[PDB]
Ligand binder design. Sequence first.
Ligand SMILES: Cc1ccc(NC(=O)c2ccc(CN3CCN(C)CC3)cc2)cc1Nc1nccc(-c2cccnc2)n1
Length: 268
Amino acid sequence: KPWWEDEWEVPRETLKLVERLGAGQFGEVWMGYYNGHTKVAVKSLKQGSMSPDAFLAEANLMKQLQHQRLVRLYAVVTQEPIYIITEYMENGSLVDFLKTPSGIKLTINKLLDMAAQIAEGMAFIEERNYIHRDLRAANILVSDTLSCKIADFGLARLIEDNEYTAREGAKFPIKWTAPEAINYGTFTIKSDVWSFGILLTEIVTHGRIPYPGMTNPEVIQNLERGYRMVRPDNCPEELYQLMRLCWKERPEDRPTFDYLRSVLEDFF
Ligand SMILES: Cc1ccc(NC(=O)c2ccc(CN3CCN(C)CC3)cc2)cc1Nc1nccc(-c2cccnc2)n1
């Protein structure tokens, strides 16, 4: 099928990829320019590491799950080497942006609005009957207008295994993962709600790492004891209490992203 019949497919020629943001054991991620006028992020598949159709499976969801609060698919190149292209965000990821001087200037009101947007897109993902699995500030992109786009960069499969590790379990961010996911490998949307609560502490603490003063092993040990993160300084007790709802022990007792979105929106 001709590429101009499609809304996504573009001739590889339209792409001048310039910098290698991050390569792994399934392909690289470059920054480059589409027809010279737009800068874009380009995910490429390396041959052999996986099915061409398995790579495209992602691109395909992105077509189907378009939404203002999701990172929007920009273009795709199907032939090998395969590219998935989105647009580049000069503000970067939420966790990065928060630590910038302009990020640190953000008001609690603006922070809460971004949280609301993140909840909003998660609510859409829930509504479309998917989950995220790695919902945290590192997979959130900040737009030019300072709104938040939910991304999934495949952060986990992006790290190369070393001589010292041989886990054949699951891969997940210890400090963001609900205990039922840690213990029983059961990841659900309610599992993402947990992550969202931890994400909230990142938002309200300039992108600070969760569970300050605890190693990932320590974190898991304390989770077994029912331990919950301490309310970040200056973080409003009400917001914290909202976090505590995201960290209910039983996943079904945790709010929905709709409720989260709602509470967040009319918070002030
Ligand atoms: C180049 C690319 C290719 C694919 C994607 N895809 C996604 O971001 C994504 C988002 C949501 C889902 C939904 N998914 C449903 C299933 N569950 C299990 C997970 C979530 C899937 C993929 C993004 C990008 N964009 C991207 N990638 C890496 C870095 C950047 C980037 C851009 C600007 C500034 N800095 C970094 N941008």
